[PDB]
Design an enzyme around this catalytic site. Structure first.
Site: not given
Ligand SMILES: CC(C)c1cccc(=O)c(O)c1
Ligand SMILES: [Zn+2]
Length: 258
Positions: A62, A196, A94, A117, A104, A92
């Site tokens: 992911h 999250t 998103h 993050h 996010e 990492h």
């Protein structure tokens, strides 16, 4: 049929396996810049990454995680709203399918192209697994990415992504300096929240920097070439791996700056 970011296993579904999805301190949230409270008791953040030791990069299905040696106090976050010392374990991102989404957290409902993050755990709990059980276990430094000029300090990451295209692939990733990912200002917002992604544990002091970093369209396009699937399985591009903003409930976001 495990969790993911599709129609059938995405954020609206997560509560069935992880009921805390509907808890009292979930992340992310929208940051309403006008209702965040300046808090003069908040300290400057202390980001001490000069001795950081990166080890490996991993496609975990992911995200891609850049992992650090957290067996000693080499790369630590302190100060700001934190009491105690938090060790960097991994970072990492998103990101979105399009430059107009991917973050996010949002700022006055604005979505950035991506969000970094940097994950750290409270050393008083001894390891990450124990820390995530505790309300003050983690401190995540969130940095927004906008598309514009390239971030030179990101390119080493971008360049190895073709070696970890699919879920479970890893590659050696030594001598990466995460200072190269930070904006000029360490002005931040802070609030108590959660992971999250599943398991959505309510263990995070969020520290979200006000100043985005710029990355180039080519840099983020390379993120979107990764795959959620394993090798030899049908290709599903790793895009839109973000959870939408959750209810703020009984929380106030604090600002370090006026
Ligand atoms: C590996 C998972 C549980 C995780 C852990 C910690 C912080 C994050 O920001 C995130 O997206 C995911
Ligand atoms: Zn994350």
């Amino acid at each position: 049929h495990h969790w993911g970011y599709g129609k059938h296993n995405g954020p609206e579904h997560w509560h069935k396996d992880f009921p805390i999805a509907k808890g009292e301190r979930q992340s992310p949230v929208d940051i309403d810049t006008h209702t965040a409270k300046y808090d003069p008791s908040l300290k400057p953040l202390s980001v001490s990454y000069d001795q950081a030791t990166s080890l490996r990069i991993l496609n975990n299905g992911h995200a891609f995680n850049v992992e650090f040696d957290d067996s000693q106090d080499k790369a630590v976050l302190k100060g700001g709203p934190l009491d105690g010392t938090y060790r960097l374990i991994q970072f990492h991102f998103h990101w979105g399918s399009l430059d107009g989404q991917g973050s996010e957290h949002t700022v006055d409902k604005k979505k950035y192209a991506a969000e970094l993050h940097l994950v750290h755990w409270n050393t008083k709990y001894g390891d990450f697994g124990k820390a995530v059980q505790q309300p003050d276990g983690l401190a995540v430094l969130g940095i927004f990415l906008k598309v514009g000029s390239a971030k030179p300090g990101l390119q080493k990451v971008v360049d190895v992504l073709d070696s970890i295209k699919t879920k479970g692939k890893s590659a050696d990733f030594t001598n990466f300096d995460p200072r190269g990912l930070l904006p000029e200002s360490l002005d931040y917002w802070t609030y108590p929240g959660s992971l999250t992604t599943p398991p959505l544990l309510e263990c995070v002091t969020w520290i979200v920097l006000k100043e985005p970093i710029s990355v180039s369209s080519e840099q983020v396009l390379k993120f979107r070439k990764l795959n959620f699937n394993g090798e030899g399985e049908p290709e599903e591009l790793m895009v839109d791996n973000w959870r939408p903003a959750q209810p703020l409930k009984n929380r106030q976001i604090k600002a370090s700056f006026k």
